[PDB]
Amino acid sequence: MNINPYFLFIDVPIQAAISTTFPYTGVPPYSHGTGTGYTIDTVIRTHEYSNKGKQYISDVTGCTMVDPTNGPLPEDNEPSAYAQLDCVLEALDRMDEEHPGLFQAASQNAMETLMVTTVDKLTQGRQTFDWTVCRNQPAATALNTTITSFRLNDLNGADKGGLIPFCQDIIDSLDRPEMTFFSVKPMKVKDKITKVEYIKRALSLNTMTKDAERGKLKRRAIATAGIQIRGFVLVVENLAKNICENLEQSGLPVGGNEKKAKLSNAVAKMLSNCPPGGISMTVTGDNTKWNECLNPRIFLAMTERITRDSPIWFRDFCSIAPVLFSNKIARLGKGFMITSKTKRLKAQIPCPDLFSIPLERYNEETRAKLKKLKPFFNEEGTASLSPGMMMGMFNMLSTVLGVAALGIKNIGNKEYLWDGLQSSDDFALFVNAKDEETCMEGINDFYRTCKLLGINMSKKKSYCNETGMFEFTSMFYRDGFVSNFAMELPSFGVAGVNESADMAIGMTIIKNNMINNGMGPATAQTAIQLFIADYRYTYKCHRGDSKVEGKRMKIIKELWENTKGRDGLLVADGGPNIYNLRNLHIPEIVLKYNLMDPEYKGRLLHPQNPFVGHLSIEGIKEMDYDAVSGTHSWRTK
């Protein structure tokens, strides 16, 4: 007899057991070496979908600019970024008609939020491309460095505290003939650059291979932007989020229970609205080259139309971000490694010296890549990337565009209606008609409409089936029963601060993963068991009666023998594990307090214990946690 795991699906629906097909126990793929190859591939692909557009030379930076919008309509099924402005405006106007006053209300809301916003908000972001050193650094560090640099050049807008003066200083910096900044060469130094170089650096992008991405055989590159545009992208995203919140078909921003509720409600609404005797079909789609095909100029037009009835200054403020993105420049990374096997020698060619050697010495793939990149290359090692949205960062605005595309609902008064849900690069399109052939006709019309707006539905990865079952952002729906949001369950290991706050963090993460993400009771209890095992192994504080031997474990055993009331002991001191689903949120020390005897309880709760020492407001709370300032709140060396 030969076992066959897939035979399980014979007796159980695939959706019910979809978790079996997710290999999340394996080591996620990781990229080795340079990311320049993938960045060049992204640049080439972005320029390929738009080469038929208008090509010119920028008069501010001297880069090569490719503009596909208002270009010739596509004639094949390949990805097309030749979006038409008129159609985008029509879609936005229709969405306005379906949502009267929504655009201006959202613009006002975002504008007032931007008034009240302060510069410190910029510190809430993730890694950002600091230009003073040209590297990815924490948002706070980049903000501090840029503020100091602006101080050196008589730009003291950030002093006012508001985000408006900071962004005003940002734009005015582009006007300075020369800029002085603090660099690291390691020691601190002052360095001066010219206006064009500063403009290029501000518009520049850092590129790196995405690591630990699941479900993708080949790696792909991702982009981090500078600190200059963070305010403008923030306000644009706030505006787009305000619009999305009021859009029924927007699969954002809430996640979890509201996600399943939205899926089910959309499905039910769609069934109910079906003409009698007709049919409803659902298309699970995936957008190929979603980032590449979208054009920043289309987003500029979107912002201009959204702020139709808003003050001129706010219109300019919204419009800045698309302008900078449309002129973005991409850094190509670390370069390429050339090796002679006979001599066992290797040498790294950085991006500026990419063409310093004849292309014959490169492999075929890199040879073709560089040959196609030549025109868009710059002497300093960066590439012009006027089209495309490599960094993303317009998830809300892109979602707005997708929803607007979904809002047409009909073409030429044909006998079919279509609606659905859109979230970033994923979507589900429901179509009702009299027969499946008409539904496919409507889906073809939707595909053409999406082509028209710069969105390319992927024919290889999308599919259609009678309404009732589908997939959306890893959420599988089948006759009401939504399977789950398949997410990488994390390592319930040692959080890594101290003895007590460690346990607090562990139990809090278990509770949150239970309450926000999908995890049932038995899974959570096994999670608690695994975390306690890892905790005891890491701190070598196994149970007092546990015959494991060790340096500290010897004194732990001595305590166990000495102890009279063993029920009230912390696992850090070899005590029994008491945590469960009920008492997940309560700190262990308070749980056991009633049980612990004074003989050891007094020592644990020593006011002037020699371990914790001087404390800080961050120390006890820093995510936040609950704990007791006992003997298990010590710090590092």
């Binding site: 057991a17 208002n70 040498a347 024919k459 290889k460 089936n465 009678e466 689903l581």
Partner: protein
């Protein structure tokens, strides 16, 4: 302060202000300050429109007032009604929010409640707005500024002044005046002028066909693009089509047919540690978890015959393996582990240097030197080889899912259950552990995790030293006896791991009972000697030493430390099923799921094939199989498996749709098939998954009839 807020303002005012805040999305508790202001604003905008009405002809004093409030109501409704009035009365619509509208002058009122001087605040509001609205600024210092003469008489002005009389002092007497924030602060930033350089950037950032940004703005603001979508679609080429195609069982051809081609070499064994062929030397202990070196020393002492072997018979040699060096390294390992010294370090000798690959990395030189040189060229990347199905993977799956008389898991305890939820959780864990703990896969996973933990510790703490790391496990049989299992020994090379992907070489010498010559294709990577024989079941079974050179990085070791997560993936899975059968029944189905009851019979799952016939196993068997599948996902996980799973999920969903008679359609089936097939290169689990997918697809086709 909220308790004080409730005093001066009724519940409706407070809730309207809180809702207006809700359209701002900053914690209302964080700063009631502007809340105060807005409610005050709202309040005045209501008192100006309390008793002032108009008649059907214009009498100043029926169902129509002389004013209409905008503040407080939802922003979308406020703006829609404001636009309605603007278009009805044919008056310029303010670009800012309107606070109040008049029915006599037909103009939009703006009101501002400031702290100090009013005239300067009035001029600042004019700067913000200009003349689009009439401004009614008030200030607690009996100050006022109205831009219209007959907007309101003295009665309303006096009433509002009186209403602010309490708040000008009432806050101070109860000590609240100090922390009262102004009203201009929330609107300090109004001025925003673009520089010349940014203006040019915006100018060149216009869609094709427009001269500059001004033209684009005029076009977007003025022209009505009705019919653009239909026109463009009509003039678009028909070639741009999704190409619908109804799916049928015939279209679903087997995936990756090349795996049936016998020319390609059968996929070889590549797992880090032996999984089903492992032979653990067992030593009986009753307690202390002694040192790994001491444990290995004792285990080898028990089997001195195998330990003392020095004239091996070379059974299999790998293509690029030095048999003498491997044997010398093994003897060095055994001697070092059997010595009296606590340290387990191996001297960096010639054979050790070769096995660890000492001094193989290419030297780095300056970029200029490489550029000048001609013979230096970028090496062509190595592509994974194509391989065909191998039966050893099927044997691994079959054997590791079979129950064994051992227990490797030693999970810790938890607090007593109280509530029903923890009771059901304990029941589920009881059943799932009772099933899993007695399976070979669990022991293999424990060996993997323990070895990876030891390897990571040694690599991080002994970067510059060669170390011998015994492959050890702790097991307990059903009768309570405790054994320590020694499966083999590992030599750790230099581990100066700086990057996450830095590779450290490990030489594994693992005991086994399988003769490699039985399945030659399974062992092209393994150098196998015959080290001895053992008495087990009345037969002298040969014991071989599988010697191999492998490599791992920090990421793989860290994930190996966390291999226990496999449990979770299995547990959750089965729990879902249990939950599902609870939904159909409405009560806990765990007992019925596992052991059944008078009402519901025990559940069964189609498990595999026997003589070409489908066979069914119990719930526990399916649990164990999915657990071994998770363990396999771990041991054979890499980019190929991720890609294959991601691309085949779509085909699985299409098959499910066909089963449900949901008449699924496809748009480009060949593309999906190519995406699935390009991931099947050399990963044994991926190849076997393709084979099983083909077989199960065939069975589903047979059933569909």
């Amino acid at each position: 302060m909220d308790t004080f807020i409730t005093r001066n303002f009724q519940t409706t005012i407070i809730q309207k202000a809180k809702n207006t805040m809700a359209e701002f999305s900053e914690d209302p508790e964080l700063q009631p300050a502007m809340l105060f202001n807005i409610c005050v604003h709202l309040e005045v905008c209501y008192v100006i429109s309390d008793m002032n009405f108009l008649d059907e002809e214009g009498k100043a004093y029926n169902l129509r007032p002389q004013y209409e409030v905008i503040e407080g109501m939802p922003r979308t409704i406020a703006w829609m009604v404001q636009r309605s009035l603007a278009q009805e009365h044919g008056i310029e619509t303010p670009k800012y929010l309107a606070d109040l509208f008049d029915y006599k002058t037909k103009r939009f009122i703006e009101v501002g409640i400031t702290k100090g001087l009013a005239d300067d605040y009035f001029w600042k509001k004019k700067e913000k707005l200009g003349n689009s609205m009439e401004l009614m600024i008030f200030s607690y210092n009996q100050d006022y500024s109205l831009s219209n003469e007959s907007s309101l008489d003295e009665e309303g002005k006096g009433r509002v002044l009186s209403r602010l009389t309490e708040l000008q002092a009432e806050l101070s007497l109860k000590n609240l005046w100090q922390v009262l924030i102004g009203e201009e602060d929330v609107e300090k930033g109004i001025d925003f002028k673009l520089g010349q350089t940014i203006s040019r950037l915006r100018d060149i950032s216009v869609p094709a066909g427009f001269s500059n940004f001004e033209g684009m703005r005029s076009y977007i603001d003025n022209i009505d693009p009705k019919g653009a979508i239909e026109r463009n679609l009509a003039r678009m080429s028909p070639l741009v089509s999704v190409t619908p195609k109804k799916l049928t069982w015939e279209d679903l051809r087997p995936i990756g047919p090349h795996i049936y081609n016998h020319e390609l070499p059968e996929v070889p064994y590549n797992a880090f540690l032996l999984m089903s062929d492992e032979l653990g030397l067992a030593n009986m202990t009753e307690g202390k978890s002694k040192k790994p070196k001491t444990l290995a020393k004792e285990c080898l002492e028990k089997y001195s015959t195998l330990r003392d072997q020095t004239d091996p018979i070379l059974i299999m040699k790998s293509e690029k393996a030095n048999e003498n060096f491997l044997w010398k390294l093994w003897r060095d390992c055994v001697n070092t582990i059997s010595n009296e010294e606590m340290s387990n370090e191996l001297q960096k000798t010639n054979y050790a240097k070769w096995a660890t690959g000492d001094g193989l990395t290419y030297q780095k030189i300056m970029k200029e030197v490489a550029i000048d040189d001609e013979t230096m060229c970028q090496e062509e990347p190595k592509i994974p080889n194509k391989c065909r199905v191998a039966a050893w993977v099927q044997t691994e799956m079959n054997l590791l899912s079979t129950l064994t008389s051992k227990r490797a898991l030693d999970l810790p305890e938890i607090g007593p259950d109280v509530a029903p939820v923890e009771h059901v959780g304990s029941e589920r864990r009881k059943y799932f552990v009772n099933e899993i703990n007695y399976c070979k896969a669990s022991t293999v996973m424990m060996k993997y995790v323990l070895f990876h933990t030891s390897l990571l510790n040694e690599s991080n703490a002994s970067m510059g030293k060669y170390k011998v790391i015994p492959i050890t496990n702790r097991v307990v049989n059903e009768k309570g006896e405790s054994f320590d299992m020694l499966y083999g020994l590992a030599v750790k090379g230099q581990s100066h791991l700086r990057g996450d992907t830095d590779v450290v070489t490990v030489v594994t010498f693992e005991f086994s009972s399988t003769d490699p010559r039985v399945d030659s294709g399974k062992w092209p990577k393994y150098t196998v000697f015959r080290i001895g024989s053992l008495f087990v079941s009345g037969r002298e079974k040969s014991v071989y030493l599988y010697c191999r050179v492998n490599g791992t990085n920090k990421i793989q070791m860290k994930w190996g430390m966390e291999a226990r997560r496999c449990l979770l993936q299995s547990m959750q899975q089965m729990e879902a099923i249990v939950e599902q059968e609870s939904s159909i029944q409405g009560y806990d189905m765990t007992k019925a799921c596992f052991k059944g009851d008078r009402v519901n019979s025990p559940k069964t799952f189609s498990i595999g094939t026997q003589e070409g016939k489908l066979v069914k196993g119990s719930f526990g068997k399916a649990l164990r199989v999915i657990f071994t599948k998770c363990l396999m996902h771990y041991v054979f996980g890499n980019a190929q498996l991720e890609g294959f799973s991601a691309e085949s999920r779509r085909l699985l969903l299409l098959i499910q749709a066909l089963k449900d008679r949901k008449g699924p359609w496809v748009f480009d089936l060949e593309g999906m098939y190519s995406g699935i097939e390009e991931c099947i290169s050399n990963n044994p689990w991926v190849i076997q998954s393709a084979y099983w997918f083909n077989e199960w697809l065939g069975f589903e086709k047979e059933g569909s009839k």
